[PDB]
């Protein structure tokens, strides 16, 4: 049991080794409610967040917005619209490679 | 000016250093930098390791 446990974790970790590490995303995110028809059980579940990302050239910036689940973000500043990703305080996040099932 | 958890924020911090760990820049009394900055990057030892 212990060997299965350790080997699965080891293989899991190896598979993420070559994938992009998402450190450019630890920026403040300004989040508002989603402009759509949301059922009662989904109210407040999603947030529409914009942020300023780096790009291919380090002296250029881009405006990006995306939808996030509320569980992946945490408020900050003055408990208003300024939110950040949850992982930013604990550790950097790695994106899983899209080609790997 | 120290970096912080978020890339687009900075914090002002002060600390005490031993003189032997810093080197003046351009003979300017106000400006100093850490000794290792021109040479290899420094690494902090883990506080959990004796």
């Amino acid at each position: 049991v212990e060997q299965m446990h350790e080997d699965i974790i080891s293989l899991w970790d190896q598979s993420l080794k070559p994938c992009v590490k998402l450190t450019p995303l630890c920026v403040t995110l300004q989040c508002t409610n989603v402009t759509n028809n949301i059922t009662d059980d989904m109210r407040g579940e999603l947030k529409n967040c914009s942020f300023n990302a780096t790009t291919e050239l380090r002296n250029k910036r881009q405006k990006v917005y995306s939808l996030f689940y509320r569980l992946d973000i945490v408020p900050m500043g003055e408990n208003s619209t300024n939110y950040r990703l949850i992982n930013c305080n604990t550790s950097a996040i790695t994106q899983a490679c899209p080609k790997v099932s | 000016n120290a970096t912080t958890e978020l890339r687009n924020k900075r914090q002002k911090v002060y600390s005490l250093f031993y003189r032997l760990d810093i080197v003046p820049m351009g003979e300017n009394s106000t400006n100093y930098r850490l000794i290792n900055c021109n040479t290899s990057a420094i690494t902090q030892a883990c506080p959990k390791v004796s």
Partner: antibody
Amino acid sequence: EVQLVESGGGLVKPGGSLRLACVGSEFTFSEAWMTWVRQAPGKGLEWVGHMRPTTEGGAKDYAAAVRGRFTIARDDSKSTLYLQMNSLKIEDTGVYYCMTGVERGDFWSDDYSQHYNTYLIDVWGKGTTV
Amino acid sequence: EIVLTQSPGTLSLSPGDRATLSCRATQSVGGDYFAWYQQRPGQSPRLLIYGTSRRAAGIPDRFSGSGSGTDFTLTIDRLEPEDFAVYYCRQYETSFTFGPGTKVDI
């Protein structure tokens, strides 16, 4: 050279209509907050109305004096702001100015922190007289 | 529907003196929504100060100001001949209107 150029002003007898336009250049038009201000001879600066950046939703607002008579519109492919003034009155005579703001800045990121130092370029056109 | 007023009607100062220009609101305006412009007669107005205290790009350091709520001030450290213009205050939070303007004269 960031600039705005107004055109179309002239005097139309009361009850008629006139269309003004303003062409922006050297600025992403669609990202700009465009505002019409007018000044009749001997008068101060009167707000006419405005339209928020296209990219921020295109919301509009108007001075009470022109609500229901004036219409604000934009066509970003032409970098042009328009004002359609219907049911003109004598009190609508004056200089119509096209004014907006452009924030440009020098972005520079490292691998541990990023910064964006911005500067605001107040751009007004010369104004067109109605 | 907040209205701005200004004082004095005309400010009479010699060149080289210090201008003080007042603006008052009927209701509070957030600092990030208050601004001043300089209108040399015959010219389009030019933004001096925005966000209550922030200087516009291209504007000389002699221009400065401060304020909050319903009480704001624009000042000029030393008047130049070109500064004897009409200054207007403008709000842009809920109300996008201008005050009447103050002429600076000698």
